[PDB]
Structure 1
Amino acid sequence: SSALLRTGKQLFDTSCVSCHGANLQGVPDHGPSLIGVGEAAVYFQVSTGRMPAMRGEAQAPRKDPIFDEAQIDAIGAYVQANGGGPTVVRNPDGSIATQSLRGNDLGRGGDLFRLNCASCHNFTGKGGALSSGKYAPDLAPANEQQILTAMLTGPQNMPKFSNRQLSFEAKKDIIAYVKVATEARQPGGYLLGGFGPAPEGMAMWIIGMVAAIGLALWIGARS
């Protein structure tokens, strides 16, 4: 029943037309056109919850999603029927794919991540701050298809990596590196957040120095 996007253009009309237009034309006040975009953009924007957005400012944050029970497919197909944007990857069942996109190679994936991705996020995918509000979020709770569609559609202020400058193996290997870097142990004790020497200096000053000064107060008399 693929000839059914009457749902789709049933939810868009009651949740989007106030900021994108009835014909997906980009109300000149708030929203962009949404014509050249495809199913991948809608999937990434709605499944992560950044969509339907309230006031709208420097960065729409990630929230709880509103739509599922196969209506993300409905809106995605309805938007794809009005343009030629990229599409979401599918497995031989028709559902959205996963662990087969784990670039069996983590060295190349990590080198590509450090060259292309680590500048804004982190060494290991923690957050990073951009200018005047905007920031780069954490990469821990995003699944594989969300990572692929994120670097494929190029969301707000994030560059757009096509399938010609970043082939599909490159994307799969980057996905594998991200999912491994977010799920590995810390083989040295409790890591203090993923950042550099700021949590380390704080932990020194607030644990080791208070222990030392407390023992100095206990041993030596006060006068």
Structure 2
Amino acid sequence: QSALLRTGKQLFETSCVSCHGANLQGVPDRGPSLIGTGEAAVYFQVSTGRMPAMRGEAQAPSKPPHFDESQIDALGAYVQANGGGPTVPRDDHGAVAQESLIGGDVARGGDLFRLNCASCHNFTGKGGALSSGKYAPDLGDANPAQIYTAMLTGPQNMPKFSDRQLTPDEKRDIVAYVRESAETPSYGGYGLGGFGPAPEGMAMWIIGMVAAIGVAMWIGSRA
């Protein structure tokens, strides 16, 4: 659709030339080339709000998006027309697929996530720190399409898992585990962040020991 292409370029000119160039070749030491990244990379980077970036640092953080769904599609089509690349999955009505990406085998997705993702995102997608100022953000806010596009395009330091390394059905199983492990309530009480022993030791010292010492004060005497 020529309407979608010129809208995407018109949006691109006033938002993405300073760092990516007018012809999407990239600006050295300011931004890489966008040729061949595909519509999937643009969808993830804009819908997650990661782009447009504001400065150079260790890692560009997520923030509220600067464009809506229609403008994201226009921007994706413009970049897609220059070099091709992967595309975001879509449903029957042509909208971005969200529910249809939920796989039916969460047990397989859990093993795949623990093999391929747990290392950077933690047992239950709570996030993890990387080498120098970089980190794997918590996965509780990404919709299934965003997780699929992140696995497809491999943003920043995340590996670019291809449809051959991880088949569409394997990706759907992984996002099913990601979506369910974030929406599953804790069974033994308050989750304490799900980070493991570190919050557990902090909670003990600040709650149980404080109560135990406070009770000891009430029963015992001073001086």
TM-score of the two chains, using structure 2 as the length reference:
0.97
- Residues 9-57 of structure 1 show CA distances to partners (whole Å, capped at 9, x for unaligned) of 1011111111111111111131111001100000000000000111121
Distance 1:36 1:98 in 2: 24
Q: Distance in 2 between matches of 1:96 and 1:69?
A: 9
Name the residue aligned to 1:58. 58
Q: 1:26 to 1:167 in 2, by over 3 A?
A: same
Q: Which residue of structure 2 aligns with residue 71 of structure 1? A: 71
The superposition leaves residues 59-105 of structure 1 with CA deviations (integer Å, 9 ceiling, x where unpaired) of 00001101115011111111111112101111110100122221111
1:38 has 2:31 as partner: no
- Cα distance in structure 1, aligned partners of 2:63 and 2:79: 22
Number of aligned pairs? Answer: 222
Q: How far apart, CA to CA, are the structure 1 residues paired with 2:220 and 2:156? A: 60
What SS class does the counterpart of residue 213 from structure 2 fall into?
Answer: helix
Q: Counterparts of 1:57 and 1:26 in 2: how far apart (Å)?
A: 18
Which segments of 5 or more consecutive residues in structure 1 lack a partner in the other structure? Answer: none
Determine the structure 2 residue equivalent to 1:19.
19
2:169 counterpart residue number: 169
3-state DSSP class of the match of 1:62? coil
Q: SS state of the match for residue 54, structure 2?
A: coil
1:82-93 equivalences under 5 Å are 82-93=82-93
User: Secondary structure at 1:111's aligned position in 2?
Assistant: helix
1:109 is the counterpart of 2:80:
no
Aligned to 1:210: 210
Cα distance in 2 between the residues matched to 1:148 and 1:83: 21
- 1:122 aligned residue: 122
Alpha-carbon contact 2:91-2:100 (below 8 Å) kept: no
- Offset, 1:200: 1.0
Moved over 4 A (4+): none
Determine what percentage of the aligned residue pairs are the same residue: 78
1:145 is matched with which residue?
A: 145
Q: Which stretch of structure 1 is more off in the superposition, 26-35 or 42-51?
A: 26-35
Whole-Å separation in 1 of the counterparts to 2:123 and 2:96? 29
2:29 and 2:203 map into 1 onto residues whose CA distance is 48
Question: Which structure 2 residue ranges, 5 or more long, are not aligned?
Answer: none
> RMSD between aligned alpha carbons?
0.9
CA distance in 2 between partners of 1:220 and 1:73 (Å): 69
Query: d(CA) in 2 for partners of 1:222 and 1:67?
Result: 64
CA distance in 1, matches of 2:22, 2:82: 12
Q: Measure, in 1, the Cα distance between the counterparts of 2:203 and 2:81.
A: 55
Give the distance between the partners of 1:7 and 1:171, measured in 2 at CA: 31
Pick the structure with more helix per residue: 2
C-alpha displacement of 1:3: 2.3
